[PDB]
Amino acid sequence: HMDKAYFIAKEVSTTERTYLKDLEVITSWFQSTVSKEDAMPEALKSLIFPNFEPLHKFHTNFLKEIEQRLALWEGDVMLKNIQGMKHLAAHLWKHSEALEALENGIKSSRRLENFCRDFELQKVCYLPLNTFLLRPLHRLMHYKQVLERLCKHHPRDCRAALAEITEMVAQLHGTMIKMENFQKLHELKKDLIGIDLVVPGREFIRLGSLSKLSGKGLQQRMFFLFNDVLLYTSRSNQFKVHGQLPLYGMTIEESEDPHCLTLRGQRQSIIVAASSRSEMEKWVEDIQMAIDLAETMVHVCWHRNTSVSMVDFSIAVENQLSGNLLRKFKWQKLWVVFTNFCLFFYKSHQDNHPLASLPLLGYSLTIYVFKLHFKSHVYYFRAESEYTFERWMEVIRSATSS
C-alpha cells in the first residue's frame, strides 16, 4: 500500500507483537520459574495466572487476524475483536487484586522475595516485574490512541471502535490508576534505604536530583516528593534516606544567598539548589500544589540531574511505540522497543532477550532519519516509512527533550 491508513496497521501489529512478548514474561517465562520452584501458594498461583493466560491465547488469535489482513492488503478486525475483549474485562478487574497480593506475599515469604528479585535479574525481565502486570491494562490505552487516530484520518466502523474502547477504558479507569500509583510507590521502596512508605493514604508526586546546599558546599542529593512528605537521600547498594519534611504546612520561596530556592518547614528548613531554571520552576509548582492540596529511573535521574513525575510517567506510557529501524554512528538493522522512557534493542522480531538498552533522559532529538544527541554519545536512527518516521519522533520527542 501507499497511504497513511495502512501504515497504522503496521504500528498496531508491531506493538501487539511486543505486547504478547510481555505476556510471555508471565504466561511463559515467569510461569516456568514458578512451576520449577512450586514455591508460590496455590491460592496466589491460582490468582495471577488464571487471569493472564487467556489474554495471550486471545491476543495471539487477534494477532493472527490482523497480520492476515495485512498480507491481504499488500477496520472490521478491530470492532470484531474489540467487542470480544468485553468477555475479558472480568480478568482485568482481578489485576489490581493481584498486584496488591503479589506484594503481600513478598512482604512475608522471604523465599518469594529472594526469588522474585532473583527472577527480576533475569535477562527477559527487562522491566521490573510489577510493571508487567499492568501491560494488559496499558494495551487498552494504546488501542484508544490508534483508533482515535483513525477517526481523524478516515472521513463508520472505526467510529464504533473508538466509541467502544473509550467507554471500556474509562470504565477500567478505576484500577488503572489505583495500581498505577501503587507500583511506582512500591518499586520506590526497593531503591530507598532507611524508610520502612506504603501508607494507604499516600500518593507519589515526583522525584529527581537537586543539589542541596550545605555548610561545606553544594551536595547533590535525591529528592522524593510524595503526597504528604518530601524526603531526601544522603548520597551502600541503594539510596539511604536522610531526613523527612512533612509538607503541610511549609513555605517555599526563591533565593539568592545560585538559581535556587529554600524550603522553610514548620519543623526543619533546607536550601535547595536547582539544576537549571526550569528544573526549579518544575520542582516549585509540584511542591506548592502538593502543599495546597494537602489541606531504575532513580539512578538515571541522580546521574543526570533531572526530575521525573507521575505527570511524566503517564506521558511515556501513552507514547509507547515499537517497531523496526536502523542504527549506526559515524547501518545495523534491529527490532527496537520503546517503553518506560527507555529504548530497548533486539536482534530480531521474534526474540526474547534485549541486546542493549538506551536510557533516553536528557537526550536531545534532532535531524527518514533522526538523531539522538547527548553530551558525547550520539546515535542515528533511520525509520522505515514516512508515517513511521513521524510517529517515532512523536513518542521520542515527547519523552526526551520536550
UniProtKB/Swiss-Prot annotation:
Domain (PH): residue spans on this chain: 203-292, 318-401
Tissue expression: Detected in cAMP-treated chondrocytes, but not in untreated chondrocytes. Detected in fetal brain, heart and spleen, and in adult testis, kidney and lung.
Keyword annotations from UniProtKB, A to Z: Cell membrane, Cell projection, Cytoplasm, Developmental protein, Guanine-nucleotide releasing factor, Membrane, Phosphoprotein, Repeat, Synapse, Synaptosome
Location within or outside the cell: Cell membrane; Synapse; Synapse, Synaptosome; Cytoplasm, Cytosol
GO-annotated cellular components: cytoplasmic side of plasma membrane; cytoskeleton; cytosol; dendrite; dendritic spine; extrinsic component of postsynaptic membrane; filopodium; glutamatergic synapse
Annotated ranges, domain DH: 4-175
Top-level lineage group: Eukaryota
Molecular functions (GO terms): cytoskeletal protein binding; guanyl-nucleotide exchange factor activity; small GTPase binding
GO BP: any one term: positive regulation of skeletal muscle acetylcholine-gated channel clustering
Induction (record text): Up-regulated in response to cAMP in cultured embryonic chondrocytes.
Phosphoserine: modified positions: S269
Comment block on domains: Intramolecular interaction between the DH domain and the PH domains can stabilize the protein in an autoinhibited conformation.
Function comment: Functions as a guanine nucleotide exchange factor for RAC1. May play a role in semaphorin signaling. Plays a role in the assembly and disassembly of dendritic filopodia, the formation of dendritic spines, regulation of dendrite length and ultimately the formation of synapses.
Subunit structure: Interacts with CADM1. Interacts with RAC1.
Name recorded for this polypeptide: FERM, ARHGEF and pleckstrin domain-containing protein 1
Organism (species): Homo sapiens (Human)
Span within the parent record: 539 to 1030 of 1045
